[PDB]
Amino acid sequence: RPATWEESEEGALSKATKYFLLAEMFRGLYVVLEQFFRAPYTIYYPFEKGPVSPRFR
């Protein structure tokens, strides 16, 4: 049976601090902030070609 509000381990203060201070929104924000600081994948096409296998047609 799904738990009611009264049988929960989190306090109302703890639960609503995560509510009004957007906690996991900020977590997902920090993910793409980490991705700002890494190496892109782009190759420059007429100067650099991608993959070839000999089977290619």
Ligand X SMILES: CCCCCCCCCCCCCCCCCC(=O)OC[C@H](COP(=O)(O)OCCN)OC(=O)CCCCCCCCCCCCCCCCC
CB contact at 8 A, 18 and 24: yes
For other proteins, give the closer residue by CB, 39 or 43. 43
Site string for other proteins, 1-40 (x = CB under 8 A): ----------------------------------------
Full DSSP string of 1-57: ----SSS-SS-HHHHHHHHHTTHHHHHHHHHHHHHHTS------TTTS-----TT--
User: Please, which of residues 6-25 interact with ligand X by CB under 6 A?
Assistant: 16-17, 19-22
Partner whose footprint covers residue 17, from other proteins, ligand X, none (CB < 5 to 8 Å by kind): ligand X
